[PDB]
């Protein structure tokens, strides 16, 4: 004990390092537990090249079973509008969105002619570079005055504008609460950016709010772990796949009760909802500060290639420099641009078409009610809602045959009607099969009730 | 400007210490530090010696061992955004040129300000600490372990 | 003449250094680190080394 | 594989001075950076940027402050030389709208004046097509006027119209090739298609260089990612054997299948891969092949129909051809040609076909009237004039500024010219030279490139005539010898 | 050469057991030249 310490001490230096290094050798041996077999093999040429030979690849792509669904595209001998041919039979446009009437607009034409004559087609470069014109700023102002913010940001595609967005600010390690009924877009967002993903029920704040506090759980488990990682909630407007609306307020209380960001999509509530038509934060009069980011795309109201994200400034700029999407592809064409803009001033110009817009989707959705085998889900404001099968079949194809002999049948009686597609083996949650109607500023009242009666006729002379 | 604009690297950070005249450029910022540690003229040469020692671990200590993630925002969604750098070269390969040069290079020089400071004891002590504060991060086994919770996040 | 060729070797040096980029107070900062270190090592040289540099600068000036 | 003629490329090493220098300047940015750094956070000097609302304080901190490091300390410092905003056709002669900070570059003002004639070499013109007056634009007004600004639906429910059928049988005649599929958006195609042809179970070999959509696609898809070497026959062989032979990594299981992604012409090296040698492989060890003509269908090839007719191969035995319309043909969008089989599972099984909206009607009408144009259907020549003009132009220009002295990488035949800088200084200096001398340049850094490469690249044009090609040269003399920009020891 | 040798002798002797360490950890990094890549995995 005492004794041995001094006799330890009064030993010389150079013996007591010897010891102390045969010390650590002993509690390096111990620990060594890694029993080793010393032992090392390789393989010969020839076996190289008869495992070479017996591997064989599966063709690129599978082969097709020739009936698909999806196979025969529909050919349109025209202009996507208002009396359309499709398949060689006029019809009248119930499947485009085209919410305003803006694409045939001579305007919007003439708009899109004057920034031909000046800048021709292509931008030829990235926004990074020799990319962009005055119009592109110009359509940017115009986007961040319309909506009553500091910042806009324009993408040349609709789809990738959501998509590099949410990996912009989403890295490995946060929590993100999406909703299930999310479009493909979101889906690819979120799967593009490693973070966590949790889904709760559609329009459902109970599993909100059971998840939020199972995470805030999470957060007393380890607190410093907790310090770091950042919250978001991804919710859209008005839902693709179900034509519902989303319940903001709500969203807004359990944002600031629960320290968690909102992303916020309006693609169909962009142009259609509100007094102005700024969507649903207009719609329930929320404050635009409470909602970070709002994406949208020119393509459904605007009647035009591309989209765009709203937000605040410190929002906003980090996306010039991390949004893939727009660091790392051509602009948009001044051509678009220009219509985009012509658009929204025919927008802010009229604000009752929105009105009448609320009108006709109120008139159509009361009349199409009362159908045997079909149930129209969706609300009474959305422009785009569905059809589906009330008692459905045994199998998802039976499904989708049969509402595409309904889609037939209103085709050649001058009804053009569309059915949903889904990529069935790569969305997260399929929705059922369902024939989609779109509702625009442009149809009459009497085409209105003609297409609900031959929807009428056509599903019972179907389904019994 | 943006990362993967003229290449294809989730990290350029691990590929940093592999380029061209890294080495003879580190070699000599520290003939410099020592040249200038020189110019001072009331010091005399045990104490450049040491200083110069203790001031280029505190370097390596603060720079490989301290600052963990990247300067730039990087592709890979963070992965290392919670490793240092000494982890993130080459992507957790343990041995390397490199590494073996980074490693070898504060012996070296304990072994030449241990000769120029004629052995003394508190110079001894002093230059084993640094060089044992250096050297132990360096081992394969410490990896992605932070002791008793410090520097973690 | 001698004045643009010096404005040129400032230049140069401001290119190699990195110091084009910088605000004009870190330039201050960095050439006022930089004099005073050369002095302090031309004062260390002269006190303590032999006049050795001495003989080859007077070579060049004759 | 074997090269029915010459395939010469030099990649010229940094001299160690200049290493040494570079490296110098990096150092002192960086100390520079964190005494910035410290001083913004001691509130000793005042903050330019925005701040998160009041009512956010107590939330987590939305980005991580050393993310943005080089952003505030050494990109916002030449800023001024990337987003540069221009007011006319991108011909060869481009007219920018001038700016002026006095915050150093964290926020510009606009001046009213604006700067004209400018030589325009950021642009990517390969063949002049891009002009505000002729057939094409003509073409495009008659369509806009029919069709419209854009369609607003999809291409499997009502947004499949006459003009993208044609436009797509058009194509497939172009490239030779059975069948091809268009899309609205160049990065889309990889970032949509490649998901959809590999899954998980699969390898894919990508180059080192690749771009971000490719990388982008790959990623998306479950498939395991291999790197190999830039233009390394070797690596790509080793890769391909190890893989074979040990299968997958955790349990020994063949792979279901292999992909090689590659490029014709890489923009910031600017050299052409080496084609007879990875279909070899690619044949010898039947993996599949992916090409990204991007920058080659309408710069390289005798004709313009790509590498493949630039080193006289067989189209067949590429199995997917990707590319892109922006950079030649003047219209955006992007395409996928193979055999029909492929453009049929494509049809059905890709993410853009299903959830993205088509191309605009006046960009396909542009596009067919170019490519029209250069297979000389029009029945003119202006087809074959502009295809030599640009050999011409870029022999030209690379070897008079290779007998300058200068550093430069690439194949002789690449239209893009990267000059070397090598330095961080040297990147704004010779930015903001050229533009004081009407010349427009892109300057790429660090963060991009390895650390020691810093380049400025010359996109060529058929556009560009002997007078303004001389111009540029004389002027790009003048501020090689202004800033010693000269490292070559061979000449 | 023959003074660092009468320098070396005339050193402590822990010191230059301390060295001697320096020198055969020095000895066996050189030589270490297998290139673990430090990771583990199992099947389900
Ligand atoms: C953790 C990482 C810390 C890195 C410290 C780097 C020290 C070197 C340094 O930048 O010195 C700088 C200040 O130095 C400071 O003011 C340190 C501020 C840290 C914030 C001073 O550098 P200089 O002399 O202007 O060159």
Same mark, same amino acid.
């Given at each position: 004990?005492?004794?041995?310490?001094?006799?330890?001490?009064?030993?010389?230096?150079?013996?007591?390092?010897?010891?102390?290094?045969?010390?650590?050798?002993?509690?390096?041996?111990?620990?060594?537990?890694?029993?080793?077999?010393?032992?090392?093999?390789?393989?010969?040429?020839?076996?190289?090249?008869?495992?070479?030979?017996?591997?064989?690849?599966?063709?690129?792509?599978?082969?097709?079973?020739?009936?698909?669904?999806?196979?025969?595209?529909?050919?349109?001998?025209?202009?996507?509008?208002?009396?359309?041919?499709?398949?060689?039979?006029?019809?009248?446009?119930?499947?485009?969105?085209?919410?305003?009437?803006?694409?045939?607009?001579?305007?919007?034409?003439?708009?899109?002619?004057?920034?031909?004559?000046?800048?021709?087609?292509?931008?030829?470069?990235?926004?990074?570079?020799?990319?962009?014109?005055?119009?592109?700023?110009?359509?940017?102002?115009?986007?961040?005055?319309?909506?009553?913010?500091?910042?806009?940001?324009?993408?040349?595609?609709?789809?990738?504008?959501?998509?590099?967005?949410?990996?912009?600010?989403?890295?490995?390690?946060?929590?993100?609460?999406?909703?299930?009924?999310?479009?493909?877009?979101?889906?690819?967002?979120?799967?593009?950016?490693?973070?966590?993903?949790?889904?709760?029920?559609?329009?459902?704040?109970?599993?909100?709010?059971?998840?939020?506090?199972?995470?805030?759980?999470?957060?007393?488990?380890?607190?410093?772990?907790?310090?770091?990682?950042?919250?978001?909630?991804?919710?859209?407007?008005?839902?693709?796949?179900?034509?519902?609306?989303?319940?903001?307020?709500?969203?807004?209380?359990?944002?600031?009760?629960?320290?968690?960001?909102?992303?916020?999509?309006?693609?169909?509530?962009?142009?259609?909802?509100?007094?102005?038509?700024?969507?649903?934060?207009?719609?329930?009069?929320?404050?635009?500060?409470?909602?970070?980011?709002?994406?949208?795309?020119?393509?459904?109201?605007?009647?035009?290639?591309?989209?765009?994200?709203?937000?605040?400034?410190?929002?906003?700029?980090?996306?010039?420099?991390?949004?893939?999407?727009?660091?790392?592809?051509?602009?948009?064409?001044?051509?678009?641009?220009?219509?985009?803009?012509?658009?929204?001033?025919?927008?802010?110009?009229?604000?009752?078409?929105?009105?009448?817009?609320?009108?006709?989707?109120?008139?159509?959705?009361?009349?199409?009610?009362?159908?045997?085998?079909?149930?129209?889900?969706?609300?009474?404001?959305?422009?785009?809602?569905?059809?589906?099968?009330?008692?459905?079949?045994?199998?998802?194809?039976?499904?989708?045959?049969?509402?595409?002999?309904?889609?037939?049948?209103?085709?050649?009686?001058?009804?053009?009607?569309?059915?949903?597609?889904?990529?069935?083996?790569?969305?997260?949650?399929?929705?059922?099969?369902?024939?989609?109607?779109?509702?625009?500023?442009?149809?009459?009242?009497?085409?209105?009730?003609?297409?609900?009666?031959?929807?009428?006729?056509?599903?019972?002379?179907?389904?019994? | 400007?943006?990362?993967?604009?003229?290449?294809?690297?989730?990290?350029?950070?691990?590929?940093?210490?592999?380029?061209?005249?890294?080495?003879?450029?580190?070699?000599?910022?520290?003939?410099?530090?020592?040249?200038?540690?020189?110019?001072?003229?009331?010091?005399?040469?045990?104490?450049?010696?040491?200083?110069?020692?203790?001031?280029?671990?505190?370097?390596?200590?603060?720079?490989?061992?301290?600052?963990?993630?990247?300067?730039?925002?990087?592709?890979?969604?963070?992965?290392?955004?919670?490793?240092?750098?000494?982890?993130?070269?080459?992507?957790?390969?343990?041995?390397?040129?490199?590494?073996?040069?980074?490693?070898?290079?504060?012996?070296?020089?304990?072994?030449?300000?241990?000769?120029?400071?004629?052995?003394?004891?508190?110079?001894?002590?002093?230059?084993?600490?640094?060089?044992?504060?250096?050297?132990?991060?360096?081992?394969?086994?410490?990896?992605?372990?932070?002791?008793?919770?410090?520097?973690?996040? | 003449?001698?004045?643009?060729?010096?404005?040129?070797?400032?230049?140069?040096?401001?290119?190699?250094?990195?110091?084009?980029?910088?605000?004009?107070?870190?330039?201050?900062?960095?050439?006022?680190?930089?004099?005073?270190?050369?002095?302090?090592?031309?004062?260390?040289?002269?006190?303590?080394?032999?006049?050795?540099?001495?003989?080859?600068?007077?070579?060049?000036?004759? | 594989?074997?090269?029915?003629?010459?395939?010469?490329?030099?990649?010229?090493?940094?001299?160690?001075?200049?290493?040494?220098?570079?490296?110098?300047?990096?150092?002192?940015?960086?100390?520079?950076?964190?005494?910035?750094?410290?001083?913004?956070?001691?509130?000793?000097?005042?903050?330019?940027?925005?701040?998160?609302?009041?009512?956010?304080?107590?939330?987590?901190?939305?980005?991580?402050?050393?993310?943005?490091?080089?952003?505030?300390?050494?990109?916002?410092?030449?800023?001024?030389?990337?987003?540069?905003?221009?007011?006319?056709?991108?011909?060869?002669?481009?007219?920018?709208?001038?700016?002026?900070?006095?915050?150093?570059?964290?926020?510009?003002?606009?001046?009213?004046?604006?700067?004209?004639?400018?030589?325009?070499?950021?642009?990517?013109?390969?063949?002049?097509?891009?002009?505000?007056?002729?057939?094409?634009?003509?073409?495009?007004?008659?369509?806009?006027?029919?069709?419209?600004?854009?369609?607003?639906?999809?291409?499997?429910?009502?947004?499949?119209?006459?003009?993208?059928?044609?436009?797509?049988?058009?194509?497939?005649?172009?490239?030779?090739?059975?069948?091809?599929?268009?899309?609205?958006? +160049?990065?889309?195609?990889?970032?949509?298609?490649?998901?959809?042809?590999?899954?998980?179970?699969?390898?894919?070999?990508?180059?080192?260089?690749?771009?971000?959509?490719?990388?982008?696609?790959?990623?998306?898809?479950?498939?395991?990612?291999?790197?190999?070497?830039?233009?390394?026959?070797?690596?790509?062989?080793?890769?391909?054997?190890?893989?074979?032979?040990?299968?997958?990594?955790?349990?020994?299981?063949?792979?279901?299948?292999?992909?090689?992604?590659?490029?014709?012409?890489?923009?910031?090296?600017?050299?052409?891969?080496?084609?007879?040698?990875?279909?070899?492989?690619?044949?010898?060890?039947?993996?599949?092949?992916?090409?990204?003509?991007?920058?080659?269908?309408?710069?390289?090839?005798?004709?313009?129909?790509?590498?493949?007719?630039?080193?006289?191969?067989?189209?067949?035995?590429?199995?997917?051809?990707?590319?892109?319309?922006?950079?030649?043909?003047?219209?955006?969008?992007?395409?996928?040609?193979?055999?029909?089989?492929?453009?049929?599972?494509?049809?059905?099984?890709?993410?853009?076909?299903?959830?993205?909206?088509?191309?605009?009607?006046?960009?396909?009408?542009?596009?067919?009237?170019?490519?029209?144009?250069?297979?000389?259907?029009?029945?003119?020549?202006?087809?074959?004039?502009?295809?030599?003009?640009?050999?011409?132009?870029?022999?030209?220009?690379?070897?008079?500024?290779?007998?300058?002295?200068?550093?430069?990488?690439?194949?002789?035949?690449?239209?893009?010219?990267?000059?070397?800088?090598?330095?961080?200084?040297?990147? +704004?200096?010779?930015?903001?030279?050229?533009?004081?001398?009407?010349?427009?340049?892109?300057?790429?850094?660090?963060?991009?490139?390895?650390?020691?490469?810093?380049?400025?690249?010359?996109?060529?044009?058929?556009?560009?005539?002997?007078?303004?090609?001389?111009?540029?040269?004389?002027?790009?003399?003048?501020?090689?010898?202004?800033?010693?920009?000269?490292?070559?020891?061979?000449?």
């Amino acid at each position: 004990l005492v004794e041995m310490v001094q006799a330890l001490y009064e030993a010389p230096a150079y013996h007591l390092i010897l010891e102390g290094i045969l010390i650590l050798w002993i509690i390096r041996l111990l620990f060594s537990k890694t029993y080793k077999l010393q032992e090392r093999s390789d393989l010969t040429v020839k076996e190289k090249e008869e495992l070479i030979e017996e591997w064989q690849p599966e063709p690129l792509v599978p082969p097709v079973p020739k009936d698909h669904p999806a196979l025969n595209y529909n050919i349109v001998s025209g202009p996507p509008s208002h009396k359309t041919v499709v398949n060689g039979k006029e019809c009248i446009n119930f499947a485009s969105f085209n919410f305003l009437g803006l694409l045939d607009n001579p305007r919007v034409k003439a708009a899109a002619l004057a920034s031909l004559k000046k800048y021709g087609v292509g931008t030829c470069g990235p926004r990074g570079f020799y990319g962009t014109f005055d119009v592109h700023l110009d359509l940017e102002d115009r986007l961040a005055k319309f909506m009553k913010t500091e910042e806009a940001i324009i993408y040349s595609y609709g789809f990738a504008t959501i998509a590099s967005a949410i990996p912009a600010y989403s890295k490995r390690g946060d929590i993100v609460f999406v909703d299930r009924a999310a479009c493909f877009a979101i889906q690819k967002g979120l799967q593009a950016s490693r973070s966590d993903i949790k889904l709760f029920k559609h329009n459902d704040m109970a599993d909100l709010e059971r998840l939020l506090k199972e995470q805030e759980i999470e957060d007393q488990k380890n607190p410093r772990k907790a310090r770091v990682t950042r919250r978001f909630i991804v919710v859209e407007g008005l839902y693709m796949n179900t034509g519902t609306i989303c319940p903001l307020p709500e969203l807004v209380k359990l944002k600031y009760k629960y320290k968690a960001r909102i992303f916020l999509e309006e693609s169909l509530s962009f142009g259609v909802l509100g007094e102005h038509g700024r969507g649903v934060t207009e719609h329930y009069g929320i404050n635009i500060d409470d909602i970070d980011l709002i994406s949208a795309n020119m393509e459904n109201a605007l009647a035009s290639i591309g989209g765009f994200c709203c937000g605040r400034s410190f929002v906003i700029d980090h996306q010039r420099l991390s949004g893939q999407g727009y660091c790392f592809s051509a602009s948009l064409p001044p051509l678009l641009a220009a219509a985009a803009i012509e658009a929204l001033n025919i927008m802010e110009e009229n604000p009752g078409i929105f009105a009448v817009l609320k009108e006709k989707c109120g008139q159509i959705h009361k009349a199409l009610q009362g159908i045997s085998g079909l149930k129209v889900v969706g609300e009474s404001l959305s422009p785009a809602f569905h059809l589906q099968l009330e008692e459905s079949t045994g199998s998802r194809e039976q499904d989708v045959r049969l509402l595409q002999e309904i889609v037939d049948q209103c085709m050649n009686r001058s009804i053009a009607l569309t059915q949903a597609r889904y990529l069935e083996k790569e969305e997260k949650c399929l929705p059922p099969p369902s024939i989609r109607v779109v509702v625009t500023v442009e149809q009459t009242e009497e085409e209105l009730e003609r297409a609900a009666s031959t929807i009428k006729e056509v599903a019972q002379a179907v389904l019994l | 400007m943006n990362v993967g604009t003229a290449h294809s690297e989730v990290n350029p950070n691990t590929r940093v210490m592999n380029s061209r005249g890294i080495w003879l450029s580190y070699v000599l910022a520290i003939g410099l530090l020592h040249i200038v540690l020189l110019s001072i003229p009331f010091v005399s040469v045990p104490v450049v010696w040491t200083l110069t020692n203790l001031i280029h671990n505190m370097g390596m200590y603060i720079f490989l061992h301290t600052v963990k993630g990247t300067p730039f925002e990087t592709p890979d969604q963070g992965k290392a955004r919670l490793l240092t750098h000494w982890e993130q070269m080459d992507y957790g390969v343990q041995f390397t040129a490199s590494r073996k040069f980074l490693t070898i290079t504060p012996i070296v020089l304990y072994f030449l300000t241990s000769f120029y400071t004629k052995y003394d004891q508190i110079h001894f002590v002093l230059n084993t600490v640094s060089l044992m504060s250096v050297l132990i991060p360096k081992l394969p086994q410490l990896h992605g372990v932070r002791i008793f919770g410090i520097n973690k996040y | 003449r001698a004045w643009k060729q010096m404005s040129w070797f400032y230049y140069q040096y401001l290119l190699v250094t990195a110091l084009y980029m910088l605000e004009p107070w870190e330039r201050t900062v960095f050439n006022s680190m930089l004099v005073s270190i050369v002095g302090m090592a031309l004062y260390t040289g002269y006190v303590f080394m032999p006049q050795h540099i001495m003989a080859i600068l007077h070579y060049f000036e004759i | 594989g074997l090269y029915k003629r010459p395939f010469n490329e030099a990649f010229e090493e940094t001299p160690m001075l200049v290493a040494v220098l570079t490296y110098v300047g990096y150092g002192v940015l960086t100390l520079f950076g964190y005494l910035r750094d410290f001083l913004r956070y001691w509130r000793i000097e005042k903050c330019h940027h925005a701040t998160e609302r009041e009512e956010q304080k107590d939330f987590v901190s939305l980005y991580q402050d050393f993310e943005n490091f080089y952003t505030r300390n050494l990109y916002m410092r030449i800023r001024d030389n990337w987003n540069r905003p221009i007011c006319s056709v991108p011909g060869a002669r481009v007219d920018i709208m001038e700016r002026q900070s006095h915050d150093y570059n964290w926020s510009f003002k606009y001046t009213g004046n604006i700067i004209k004639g400018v030589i325009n070499m950021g642009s990517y013109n390969y063949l002049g097509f891009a002009r505000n007056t002729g057939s094409c634009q003509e073409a495009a007004a008659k369509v806009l006027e029919e069709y419209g600004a854009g369609v607003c639906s999809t291409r499997q429910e009502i947004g499949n119209l006459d003009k993208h059928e044609e436009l797509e049988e058009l194509v497939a005649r172009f490239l030779g090739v059975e069948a091809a599929m268009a899309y609205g958006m +160049g990065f889309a195609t990889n970032s949509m298609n490649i998901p959809a042809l590999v899954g998980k179970g699969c390898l894919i070999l990508s180059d080192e260089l690749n771009h971000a959509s490719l990388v982008l696609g790959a990623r998306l898809s479950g498939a395991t990612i291999r790197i190999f070497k830039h233009n390394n026959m070797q690596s790509l062989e080793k890769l391909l054997k190890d893989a074979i032979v040990y299968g997958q990594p955790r349990t020994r299981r063949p792979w279901k299948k292999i992909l090689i992604l590659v490029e014709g012409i890489y923009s910031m090296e600017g050299s052409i891969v080496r084609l007879p040698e990875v279909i070899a492989l690619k044949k010898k060890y039947k993996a599949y092949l992916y090409l990204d003509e991007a920058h080659s269908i309408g710069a390289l090839g005798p004709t313009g129909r790509g590498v493949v007719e630039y080193f006289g191969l067989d189209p067949e035995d590429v199995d997917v051809m990707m590319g892109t319309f922006t950079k030649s043909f003047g219209a955006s969008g992007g395409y996928i040609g193979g055999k029909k089989e492929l453009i049929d599972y494509l049809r059905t099984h890709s993410h853009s076909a299903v959830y993205a909206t088509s191309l605009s009607p006046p960009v396909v009408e542009q596009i067919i009237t170019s490519m029209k144009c250069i297979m000389g259907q029009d029945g003119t020549s202006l087809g074959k004039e502009c295809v030599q003009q640009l050999a011409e132009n870029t022999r030209y220009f690379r070897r008079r500024l290779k007998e300058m002295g200068f550093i430069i990488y690439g194949n002789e035949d690449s239209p893009v010219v990267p000059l070397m800088l090598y330095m961080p200084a040297k990147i +704004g200096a010779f930015g903001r030279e050229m533009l004081k001398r009407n010349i427009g340049v892109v300057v790429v850094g660090f963060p991009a490139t390895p650390i020691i490469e810093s380049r400025a690249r010359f996109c060529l044009s058929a556009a560009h005539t002997k007078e303004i090609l001389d111009t540029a040269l004389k002027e790009i003399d003048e501020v090689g010898d202004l800033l010693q920009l000269k490292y070559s020891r061979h000449r």
